[PDB]
Amino acid sequence: NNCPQDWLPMNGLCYKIFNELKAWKDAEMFCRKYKPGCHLASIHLYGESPEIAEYISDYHKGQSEVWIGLCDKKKDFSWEWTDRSCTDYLSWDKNQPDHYQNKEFCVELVSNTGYRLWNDQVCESKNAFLCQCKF
Amino acid sequence: NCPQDWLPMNGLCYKIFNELKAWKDAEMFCRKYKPGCHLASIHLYGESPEIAEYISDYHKGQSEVWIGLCDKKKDFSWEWTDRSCTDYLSWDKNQPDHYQNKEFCVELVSNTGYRLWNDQVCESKNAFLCQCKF
Amino acid sequence: NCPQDWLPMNGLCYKIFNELKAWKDAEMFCRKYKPGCHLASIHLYGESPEIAEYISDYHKGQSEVWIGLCDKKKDFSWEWTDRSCTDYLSWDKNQPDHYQNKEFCVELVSNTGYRLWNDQVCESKNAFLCQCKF
Amino acid sequence: NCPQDWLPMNGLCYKIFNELKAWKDAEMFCRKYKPGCHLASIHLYGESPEIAEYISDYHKGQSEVWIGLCDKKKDFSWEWTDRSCTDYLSWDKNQPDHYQNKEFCVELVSNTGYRLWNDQVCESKNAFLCQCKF
Amino acid sequence: NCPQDWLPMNGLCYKIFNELKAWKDAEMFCRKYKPGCHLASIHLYGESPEIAEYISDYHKGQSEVWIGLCDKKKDFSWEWTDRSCTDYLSWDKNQPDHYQNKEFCVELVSNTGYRLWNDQVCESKNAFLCQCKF
Amino acid sequence: NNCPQDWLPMNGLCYKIFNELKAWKDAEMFCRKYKPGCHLASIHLYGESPEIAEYISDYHKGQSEVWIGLCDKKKDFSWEWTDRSCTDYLSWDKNQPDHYQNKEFCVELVSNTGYRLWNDQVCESKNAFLCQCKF
Amino acid sequence: NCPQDWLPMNGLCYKIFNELKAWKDAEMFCRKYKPGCHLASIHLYGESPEIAEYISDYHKGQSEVWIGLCDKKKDFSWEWTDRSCTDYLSWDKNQPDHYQNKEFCVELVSNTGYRLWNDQVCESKNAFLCQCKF
Amino acid sequence: NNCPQDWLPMNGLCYKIFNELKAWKDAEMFCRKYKPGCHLASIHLYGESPEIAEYISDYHKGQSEVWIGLCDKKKDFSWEWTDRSCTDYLSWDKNQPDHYQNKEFCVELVSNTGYRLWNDQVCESKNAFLCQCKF
Amino acid sequence: NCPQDWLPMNGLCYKIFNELKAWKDAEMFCRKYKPGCHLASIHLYGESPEIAEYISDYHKGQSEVWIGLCDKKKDFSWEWTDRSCTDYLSWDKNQPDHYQNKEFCVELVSNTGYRLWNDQVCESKNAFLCQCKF
Amino acid sequence: NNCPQDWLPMNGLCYKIFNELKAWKDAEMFCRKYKPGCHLASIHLYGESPEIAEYISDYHKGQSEVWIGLCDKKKDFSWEWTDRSCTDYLSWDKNQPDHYQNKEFCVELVSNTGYRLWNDQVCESKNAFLCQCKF
Ligand SMILES: [Ca+2]
Ligand SMILES: [Ca+2]
Ligand SMILES: [Ca+2]
Ligand SMILES: [Ca+2]
Ligand SMILES: [Ca+2]
Ligand SMILES: [Ca+2]
Ligand SMILES: [Ca+2]
Ligand SMILES: [Ca+2]
Ligand SMILES: [Ca+2]
Ligand SMILES: [Ca+2]
Ligand code: NA
Ligand code: NA
Ligand code: NA
Ligand code: NA
Ligand code: NA
Ligand code: NA
Ligand code: NA
Ligand code: NA
Ligand code: NA
Ligand code: NA
């Protein structure tokens, strides 16, 4: 909050991009075991996506897509944040979500959009990821 | 304003200690760890999931977990050690029950993921969850 | 900022209405009573007993009471009418049950003091609890 | 947001009622006077002298004053009727004492300026102080 | 702190007016209704459904609804009449499109539940949503 | 809720001048029984004296002094407000308090100073008085 | 906060009076209107347009408008009549100018839309804008 | 910052017990010279007393009593805090303050009560003491 | 936080840099210095004097100072790089002037104490002022 | 608010006394060049005086006077703070300000009154001085 100087402060939390390529579950547990009170980031405001988007475009090593903490654990278009927050904001890319081949149930940030809009993607895909934390 | 090995939550800092201690022996450890600490208190439906998940990830152990709830008068009058109000409950199946009329301290049950509570014999030994102001 | 025939609670204002209406009819009655009204939403363990006592003291009859929770998708996707977050639950025992796949609207149960919820058939004509900004 | 005939104190409204009534009558009178009303609960040192003058000046009559503190278990475990915490005591000398046997309700003592408390017979008729939320 | 025929939201008061007026008339009507009023501005993602449901319930008739957003410079430089920041957008599919370079005022689209926007001829006669400060 | 329109709003309390001439101990009781939560006025900040001064000069109908709620109930220079507020501000006139002839234990605003400065006075003197209320 | 015919702005109420008066008498009228009123003061870059528009809408007839800024020392020390700090300026081009003709009071320039300031003779009858605390 | 680690944070202030035995005036000056903005502690709420009590009982090495920043320098029951705070709260033990033999004008916390209640005491005695600091 | 070598003002931390850079190069420097950094934005009349004194006492050289205001689409539409609104202006005499239609980036004028603004060539190597969020 | 330990926290700012002797001109500049966002101290509340008065008395290594950031630049009783704050508070000493021999235009705190009250004195006089900083 109280954020480290290599983290992005925003609306009470601290956000950071991780360039390692991990599957969605791998990345979630990475954040949670990084420090108490960490998850894959949640978004809740129209004005948070641009600030996140620009931050990734400036500190992202590579071009890998970026996981965030939205999941469809019931495979029925009921999307949930892993920080147990409330799905009160959506920023989907065109024609998404689409459950392509019924393989996609996790959510990434699309590089083509500036990491601004969301896409549902195959869980086991190995991407970069964005942790959020309380400090 | 917590140390980076603690859980921030609603202005206080929480932490799981893996050593085994009796309820009283656990409360005293927290109190003497640093000025202004106690066995943790819970006051919101939302704090119960948050704690359960923190423990399930950082509990370098196996056992159940003490919290600072005690039936002092032994008549279902549950006080917190930190002297805060008892305005929230999260019991397990058919708890509290005073099994053998020797159970008066409260623990977090691992079979529930550490979300529900059970009254247990105070002199038994578990891990515990401290609660500190920093 | 709320009239005296209503209960003030956490910035919003509630009132039990005794005329029986089906779930849909009740929601719309609140909506058109005044701009910014819905069937009530509940978000804290502390809000439940305060609503339960208000109903008991001001409710005429022993009928059940509608609240703004329903499953529009008919698959356990519980959504409040006022679009607030489903961040709290107080289900009765063995609920929700989707009994005979006719129950999709949630009521407060009378013989629990109105602390616990039950999903019920939408056409059932109950009392209802409005929630309004002012 | 208090009306003019009430005392505004710390976010609640307080008013004395001079009609003589037993304790359970006083509590239910407030309850049904308006939604969100009970007998007064006192929580701060600074609140006792403020209620003290208010009653001293607007108590048209001469009686003791019920407040919403009672030993519902009859074993010196006192609870407020608004479900609030018991985080403050302001007893008189030699109180509480369960004198004789049935002194389980709490009254404000006129010989203290209505500042200190005495436990008294449930069924005794007194003036009473409602607190409400407007 | 709103009247009852008005919708309270995030510190301001909103109301739908069903008389059909061109954009500049609708702005001037709000302005003269009471000091400190303008055609509504919208600043949060959650504000849109709130307005969308209000209008649907209270829109006597069937029209598009003016809001206080216009492109005075006729070059995609949209400004709110209340001088607030243009920190939020909620366009309909393909809009804004400056059709035939004659569309510079913003309306709410009934075919989206009044959630999404379209740029429209300013002289078109629409219902309108005033926004006042009390 | 707010103050009534014939009252001065200042820092959460309401103040009104009353031109009736009363003894200090009658002034206090008039205020206390005007409405629950009323006492003779209490002043706590440097900037409060000008606001109270100007207000009186405009809505005062007379040339009398004005009682305020400061009292030496002990008769030994222990000045206390009737509202139980903190004696954390002083604005004494020249050579005050004086305990003139061991009879001056109640405090009045001095019209000769614009009603900005205080004077300890005989309590039985009949002056105007300033109430202070919570609404 | 305010009455329904006043402009609420940043915790105060503003209102224009179309009667013509000399500066001194305008100030006197505001002060004896209601306790806690003066000629208006301006402190933020963003307030001047908010006032400029309010007047342009509710000013009947035409003239210039007084505000509560003057110079009693007769140099260039401008003091508000509400004793607030002179921490914001907004003069018209080449103003102030002491056009030694009794020019020591400030008015709003209709040629700017009532946004920028000008020093003009005190005795000149102009309209005025009061600033009240409700 | 907002309280070191061996200090007790409470209601926006920091507190610490010093077991070095000192006189009441000596203890005051010790605090004031420890850091800018320090005094012998001040108590203001019914709930503050037991939090202090529990803290002292746990962290007080030694057995003596404990000074707090309340004294009667007018020697007439005019009790005032050294930090200029308002005497808006009392917590005396039974039969105190008793000005025993007109020697007692400084205040201490009483062991018999768990350091919860107060006692007026000879200002020259040697007790431990409780500092209070803004950080 | 705000390091002791930065200027605290209204929740953000500002620091002068004396290394001479083109405007884009100055912006990309800030953005890459620390997450949450851009060229400075200014929003209050009172912010301009405080920035001015800071630069006059801490900058080295006599270069004009860049800020993050830019006419990106080159039509007198000035936007901040940190995405805050353009609600404040402090232009210099007869500025902006798009001189020779080659000036689209905004600098501070040393000849005004670094208080007023001027549009300038985008690659004019100047000192710059970063605005960060710690 | 984030004051280091050698500074006085008060009402959101940090203050410190410097015993080095410097003129008013020089003292104001040393503060401003110490850290970004510094000036000679400003005072705005009745209660700020005794809190400053006591801090200086405890930490002043000298017998000298103390500069504050108040001066009459126009030279006509238009007292203006150097931090550009409002002159909303006065604490003038006895028979001050007095422009003694039309030479005194800057303001100091006098040791006579425990550094509580103000005197206008000579700009070029070399006194101790008090800085005020945002941290
Ligand atoms: Ca997809
Ligand atoms: Ca058990
Ligand atoms: Ca059911
Ligand atoms: Ca008794
Ligand atoms: Ca269009
Ligand atoms: Ca006298
Ligand atoms: Ca002129
Ligand atoms: Ca004693
Ligand atoms: Ca230029
Ligand atoms: Ca002098
Ligand atoms: Na988030
Ligand atoms: Na807790
Ligand atoms: Na609700
Ligand atoms: Na209460
Ligand atoms: Na709006
Ligand atoms: Na007061
Ligand atoms: Na103003
Ligand atoms: Na204290
Ligand atoms: Na800024
Ligand atoms: Na200051």
Question: CA–CA distance from C118 to each of C81, C105, E83 (Å)?
Answer: 16, 8, 48
**In one letter, which amino acid is I99?**
Y
* CA nearest neighbour of C21 among C105, C104, C124: C124
Tokens at G57, concatenated? 């809408």
* Centroid of ligand 9 to alpha carbon of I41 (angstroms): 19
| Cβ-defined contact of C54 to D32 (cutoff 8 Å) | no
Measured CA to CA, the distance from residue G22 to residue G104 in angstroms comes to 12
Q: Tell me if the bond preceding D35 is cis, omega within 30° of 0.
A: no
Technique used? X-ray
**Helices J48-59 and H24-34, interaxial angle, to 10°?**
90
- Tell me the β-bridge partners of C21: C126
| Cβ-defined contact of G35 to F55 (cutoff 8 Å) | yes
* CA nearest neighbour of A26 among A16, A15, A40: A40
Please report, in angstroms and rounded to a whole number, the separation of the first and last CA atoms in chain B: 6
* Centroid of ligand 14 to alpha carbon of D83 (angstroms): 10
Tokens at G51, concatenated? 């006032």
Positions of chain breaks in chain A, given as the residue before each break (C to N > 2.5 Å): none
- Tell me the β-bridge partners of I79: I70
Q: Answer whether H25 touches J (CB < 8 Å).
A: no
| Cβ-defined contact of E8 to C32 (cutoff 8 Å) | no
Distance, C-alpha I16 to centroid of its chain: 10
Contacts for E84 with CB less than 8 Å, ≥ 6 apart: E41, E43
Helix (H, G, I), strand (E, B) or coil at B90: coil
Length of chain B equals 134
* CA nearest neighbour of E46 among A132, A130, A48, C11: A48
Distance, C-alpha E127 to centroid of its chain: 9
Containing C79, the helix (H) or strand (E) segment is strand C78-80
- Are C36 and C126 a contacting pair, CB within 8 Å? no
Length of chain A equals 135
Contacts for H29 with CB less than 8 Å, ≥ 6 apart: none
Contacts for C73 with CB less than 8 Å, ≥ 6 apart: none
Q: Chains with ≥3 Cβ pairs under 8 A against J?
A: F, G, H, I
Task: Please compute, for residue D104, the number of CA atoms within 13 A of its CA located in the half-sphere on the CB side.
Answer: 15
Measured CA to CA, the distance from residue E35 to residue G5 in angstroms comes to 7
Contacts for C111 with CB less than 8 Å, ≥ 6 apart: none
Measured CA to CA, the distance from residue G20 to residue C104 in angstroms comes to 67
- Tell me the β-bridge partners of J35: none
* CA nearest neighbour of B81 among B27, B123, B18, B26: B27
Tokens at D111, concatenated? 């010989």
CB atoms near residue C65 (< 10 Å): 26
Tokens at F43, concatenated? 């002043």
Tokens at B11, concatenated? 């202005």
DSSP label at I92?
A: P
Distance from CA of F36 to the nearest CA of J (A): 30
CB atoms near residue J131 (< 10 Å): 23
**To which residue do tokens 């100072």 refer?**
I65
* CA nearest neighbour of E14 among E22, E23, E4: E4
What structural domains and CATH numbers belong to chain B? 1-134 (3.10.100.10)
Determine if residue F102 is labeled as part of a ligand binding site. no
Task: Please compute, for residue H56, the number of CA atoms within 13 A of its CA located in the half-sphere on the CB side.
Answer: 32
* CA nearest neighbour of H54 among H121, H109, H91: H109
- Nearest 10 degrees: CA dihedral of J79, J84, J90, J95? -30
Q: Answer whether I133 touches A (CB < 8 Å).
A: yes
Measured CA to CA, the distance from residue B83 to residue B41 in angstroms comes to 9
Tokens at H103, concatenated? 């020697």
Tokens at C20, concatenated? 């029986």
Measured CA to CA, the distance from residue D70 to residue D83 in angstroms comes to 12
Q: What is the resolution of this structure in A?
A: 3.0
Contacts for J36 with CB less than 8 Å, ≥ 6 apart: I5, I6, I7, I8, I15, I54, I58
- Are G17 and G130 a contacting pair, CB within 8 Å? yes
- Nearest 10 degrees: CA dihedral of B58, B60, B63, B67? -40
| Cβ-defined contact of A36 to B6 (cutoff 8 Å) | yes
Measured CA to CA, the distance from residue H102 to residue H120 in angstroms comes to 10
Write the residue in E8, E46, E49 that is nearest to C36 by C-beta. E8
Helix (H, G, I), strand (E, B) or coil at I133: coil
Tokens at E63, concatenated? 């029209």
Which ranges constitute the DSSP H helices of chain C?
A: 23-33, 47-58
| Ligand lying nearest the CA atom of residue F52 | 16
Q: Chains with ≥3 Cβ pairs under 8 A against C?
A: A, B, D, E
Measured CA to CA, the distance from residue F23 to residue F129 in angstroms comes to 9
Distance from CA of D14 to the nearest CA of B (A): 23
* Centroid of ligand 15 to alpha carbon of E40 (angstroms): 6
Measured CA to CA, the distance from residue I107 to residue H72 in angstroms comes to 63
Q: Answer whether D31 touches C (CB < 8 Å).
A: yes
Count Cβ atoms within 10 A of the Cβ of residue F86 and give its class: 0-12 exposed, 13-18 middle, 19 or more buried: middle
| Cβ-defined contact of D36 to C54 (cutoff 8 Å) | yes
Helix (H, G, I), strand (E, B) or coil at A55: helix
Tokens at J103, concatenated? 């030479």
Q: Scanning every residue of chain C, which has its alpha carbon at the shortest distance from the alpha carbon of B88? A: C45
Burial D40-73 (b: 16+ CB within 10 A, else e): bbbbbbbbbebbbbbbeebbeeebbbbbbbbbee
Q: Answer whether H33 touches J (CB < 8 Å).
A: yes
**In one letter, which amino acid is H70?**
L
Beta strands in G28-122 (DSSP E): 37-39, 65-70, 79-80, 103-108, 117-121
CB atoms near residue F29 (< 10 Å): 14
Positive or negative torsion for Cα A53, A59, A63, A69: negative
E contacts of I41 (beta carbons < 8 Å): none
DSSP label at C21?
A: E
* Centroid of ligand 9 to alpha carbon of I110 (angstroms): 14
| Ligand lying nearest the CA atom of residue D81 | 14
Positive or negative torsion for Cα G46, G48, G54, G56: negative
- Are D58 and D16 a contacting pair, CB within 8 Å? yes
Measured CA to CA, the distance from residue H69 to residue H82 in angstroms comes to 5
